[PDB]
Amino acid sequence: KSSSTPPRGVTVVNNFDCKRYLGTWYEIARFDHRFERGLEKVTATYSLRDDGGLNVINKGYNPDRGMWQQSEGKAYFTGAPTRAALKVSFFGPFYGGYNVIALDREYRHALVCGPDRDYLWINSRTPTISDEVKQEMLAVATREGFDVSKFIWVQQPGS
Amino acid sequence: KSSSTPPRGVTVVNNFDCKRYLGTWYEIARFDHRFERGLEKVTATYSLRDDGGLNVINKGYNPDRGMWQQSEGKAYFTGAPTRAALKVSFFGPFYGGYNVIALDREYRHALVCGPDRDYLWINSRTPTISDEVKQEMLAVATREGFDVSKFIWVQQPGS
Ligand SMILES: CCN(CC)c1ccc2c(c1)[B-](F)(F)[N+]1=C(C)N(C)C(=O)C1=C2
Ligand SMILES: CCN(CC)c1ccc2c(c1)[B-](F)(F)[N+]1=C(C)N(C)C(=O)C1=C2
Numbered sequence: 001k002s003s004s005t006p007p008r009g010v011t012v013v014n015n016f017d018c019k020r021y022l023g024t025w026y027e028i029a030r031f032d033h034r035f036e037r038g039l040e041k042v043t044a045t046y047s048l049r050d051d052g053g054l055n056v057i058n059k060g061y062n063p064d065r066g067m068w069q070q071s072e073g074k075a076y077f078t079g080a081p082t083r084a085a086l087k088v089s090f091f092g093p094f095y096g097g098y099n100v101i102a103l104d105r106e107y108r109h110a111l112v113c114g115p116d117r118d119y120l121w122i123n124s125r126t127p128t129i130s131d132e133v134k135q136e137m138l139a140v141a142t143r144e145g146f147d148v149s150k151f152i153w154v155q156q157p158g159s
Numbered sequence: 160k161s162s163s164t165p166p167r168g169v170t171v172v173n174n175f176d177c178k179r180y181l182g183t184w185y186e187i188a189r190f191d192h193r194f195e196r197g198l199e200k201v202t203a204t205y206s207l208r209d210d211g212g213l214n215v216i217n218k219g220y221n222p223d224r225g226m227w228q229q230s231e232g233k234a235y236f237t238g239a240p241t242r243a244a245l246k247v248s249f250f251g252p253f254y255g256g257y258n259v260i261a262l263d264r265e266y267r268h269a270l271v272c273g274p275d276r277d278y279l280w281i282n283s284r285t286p287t288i289s290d291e292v293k294q295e296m297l298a299v300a301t302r303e304g305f306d307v308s309k310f311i312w313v314q315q316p317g318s
Contacts, residue, residue, distance in 0.1 A: 034251065034252060035250075035251050036250075036251055037251050037252045038251065038252060039250075039251060058250065060250070062248075062254075065248055065254060067233065067248055069232070069233075069248060069249060069250040069251070070231055070250060071230065071231075071249070071250035071251070072229055072230075072231060073228070074226065074228075089221075089224060089226055089228060090228060090230075091194075091195075091198075091217065091219070091228040091229060091230035092193065092194050092195055092196060092197065092198065092228070092230065093193055093196050093197060095221075095224060
């Protein structure tokens with residue numbers, strides 16, 4: 001399907017406050033994909049741009065090579081900035097939808113999907129999350145049609 | 160073969176001046192790979208790290224999506240810093256050898272290869288090169304066993 005639209009049916013957050021989502025997030029779990037392959041301790045960082053999009057810097061550690069790496073990209077809303085439907089673009093052939101489909105009131109925990117059900121992330125402001133938050137994230141993922149067998153639990157400080 | 164050694168039988172520069180190689184280079188031609196697919200107007204910018212490695216910033220334009228992108232990586236010598244054999248690594252699964260196989264004395268044109276003969280670049284301090292310089296670089300590539308018909312000639316200022 002189009003790499004520009006959300007997966008059909010997902011619950012895009014429609015009262016989004018972009019300022020509250022800025023800064024750094026820890027990747028608690030991801031569906032594994034080429035872009036991120038081999039990485040642990042992954043974080044994503046968002047900053048505002050003058051042009052109304054977001055600067056994205058993802059960082060992680062590759063324990064096979066013993067080195068940190070970083071990737072810088074840009075995200076732009078696909079519609080109104082109060083709707084958490086975006087597209088993100090990195091160097092090369094890494095481009096597609098970015099959608100926040102679950103978020104707590106305090107912007108502490110997020111479930112983010114790509115443009116299809118092969119792309120999903122559990123993110124947190126903290127490097128670890130409680131089992132209850134894990135359970136709820138998997139429950140939401142399942143209810144929205146995603147195959148939670150695809151998740152890998154990303155090593156983080158204290159995991 | 161090993162991703163960490165030069166291609167079999169390929170001679171690498173053995174009296175390398177790393178500091179003179181720093182700065183911005185324009186990519187005149189490349190063998191096509193996923194990492195850079197879709198990108199025109201490509202430059203690579205090298206700088207020194209406190210740890211003896213190089214920071215690498217690749218930047219290019221994707222005319223399909225209408226956007227500039229950049230990738231930041233690290234390169235380390237695999238041996239003596241006088242020998243232009245390195246390995247470069249970027250976010251995720253882009254890791255492998257980087258070898259300077261020909262350089263002019265002025266450090267204005269360089270032929271760079273990866274760890275096998277499927278990876279080759281013609282780089283220049285200027286965005287275009289003379290037919291003279293072009294043919295010589297192709298003759299070196301050819302001398303070293305590469306198939307120059309695999310080059311994509313990359314759109315650049317004045318090209
Ligand atoms: C499908 C298009 N695409 C490029 C692979 C993406 C889409 C969506 C995303 C990412 C990439 B990403 F790898 F930058 N990513 C990370 C690291 N985290 C923590 C995210 O929540 C997220 C979403
Ligand atoms: C095969 C290992 N690997 C990562 C794909 C590379 C090896 C070698 C190189 C690059 C990548 B590269 F894509 F960063 N690259 C660029 C953009 N230019 C202009 C080069 O001279 C060069 C060499």
